[PDB]
Structure 1
Amino acid sequence: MISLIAALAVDRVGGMENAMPWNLPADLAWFKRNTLNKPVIMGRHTWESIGRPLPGRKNIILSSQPGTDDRVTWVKSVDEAIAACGDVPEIMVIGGGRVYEQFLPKAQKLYLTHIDAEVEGHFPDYEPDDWESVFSEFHDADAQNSHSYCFEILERR
């Protein structure tokens, strides 16, 4: 099965630019916990932004061009990315926007972090009627985390 994992802020005319609006180590810990020992699929730009393989996961990068780093697995289509994962329980698609769009119709589960920051203007719109919330938990900002956030897991209805 295919899952998407992403961090989401509120869309708002007059909000911050999307360059770097939050700092959430707690969110990266949730990301790690829910991706470890699963294959992760990402687009080339997301790969270049992370800048190093995610340890303890099979890293699969989508690019139309040949690969340029032997530390990861390179694929040229969505179907090839899925086939590269083999027979596993859960494939994690980690971004970015173009990649989420292509995989959302295939996905059974969404792991979402709803961050209480307003940004003017990555994740596709999803029909709330087609998804059922199965886990959610709110957390206050703290000394290490700039904003409050809510983890949520949605499964197809």
Structure 2
Amino acid sequence: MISLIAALAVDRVIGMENAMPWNLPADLAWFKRNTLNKPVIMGRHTWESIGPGRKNIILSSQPGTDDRVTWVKSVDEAIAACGDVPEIMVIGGGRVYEQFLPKAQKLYLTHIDAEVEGDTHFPDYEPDDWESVFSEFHDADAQNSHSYCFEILERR
């Protein structure tokens, strides 16, 4: 199966011109929990932002620039590179989420109570086509700059 994992500010904003204006180690821990050694697919801009671990599959139209990870030139090649696994984790960014949302069976979302003027958004999903199977709200604290809610949705 294919899953998407993303952290959304209000209006489904996921990315800005620069690094996101928050500090959420709990979200980093949740991201790790839910990826572990599973194959990940990401776009080239997300790869440049995160600086590797599992299979790391990077989408780019151009030849790859780091032989430690696997570079692919299409969605189909990305899926093929992950092989026959229980769950593929699509980790961003906006252009990649848009292409994989119709293929996805599960969303792992972190809803962050932050308003940020973004340039990239998580794709529109119709909540009626998705069953919320898990939800956990957390307050901001000494380590986390904003309140946040982890949610898992499974396609209906």
TM-score of the superposition, structure 1-length normalised?
0.91
Given that residues 10 and 116 in structure 2 are in contact (C-alpha distance below 8 angstroms), is that contact kept between their aligned partners in structure 1? yes
* Distance verdict in 2 for CA 1:144–1:14, change over 3 Å: closer
For residues 34-53 of structure 1, what are the structure 2 equivalents within 5 Å?
A: 34-51=34-51
Given that residues 11 and 120 in structure 1 are in contact (C-alpha distance below 8 angstroms), is that contact kept between their aligned partners in structure 2? no
Residues 49-108 of structure 1 deviation map (CA, whole Å, 9 limit, x = unaligned) = 001xxx552100000111111110000000000000111000000000000000000000
Given that residues 36 and 56 in structure 1 are in contact (C-alpha distance below 8 angstroms), is that contact kept between their aligned partners in structure 2? no
Q: Secondary structure at the match of 1:137?
A: strand
Determine the C-alpha separation between the residues in 1 that align with 2:93 and 2:124: 14
Determine the C-alpha separation between the residues in 2 that align with 1:127 and 1:31: 23
1:120 CA drift (Å): 2.9
1:15 CA drift (Å): 14
* Distance verdict in 2 for CA 1:73–1:114, change over 3 Å: same
* Distance verdict in 2 for CA 1:19–1:64, change over 3 Å: same
Determine the C-alpha separation between the residues in 2 that align with 1:109 and 1:14: 18
Given that residues 16 and 118 in structure 1 are in contact (C-alpha distance below 8 angstroms), is that contact kept between their aligned partners in structure 2? no
- Seq. identity, %: 99
Given that residues 18 and 120 in structure 1 are in contact (C-alpha distance below 8 angstroms), is that contact kept between their aligned partners in structure 2? no
Unaligned ranges ≥5, structure 2: none
Q: Could you say what the CA RMSD is over the residues aligned between the two structures, in angstroms?
A: 2.6
Count matched residues. 154
Unaligned ranges ≥5, structure 1: none
Deviates further, 65-74 or 117-126 = 117-126
Q: Secondary structure at the match of 1:41?
A: strand
Given that residues 44 and 62 in structure 1 are in contact (C-alpha distance below 8 angstroms), is that contact kept between their aligned partners in structure 2? yes
Given that residues 13 and 122 in structure 2 are in contact (C-alpha distance below 8 angstroms), is that contact kept between their aligned partners in structure 1? no
Match of 2:133 in 1: 134
Determine the C-alpha separation between the residues in 2 that align with 1:64 and 1:102: 15
1:14 CA drift (Å): 17
Determine the C-alpha separation between the residues in 1 that align with 2:30 and 2:37: 14
Q: Would you identify which runs of 4 or more consecutive aligned residues in structure 1 move more than 3 Å? A: 12-19
Match of 2:146 in 1: 147
* Distance verdict in 2 for CA 1:27–1:12, change over 3 Å: closer
* Distance verdict in 2 for CA 1:14–1:82, change over 3 Å: closer
Given that residues 66 and 74 in structure 1 are in contact (C-alpha distance below 8 angstroms), is that contact kept between their aligned partners in structure 2? yes
Q: Secondary structure at the match of 2:11?
A: strand
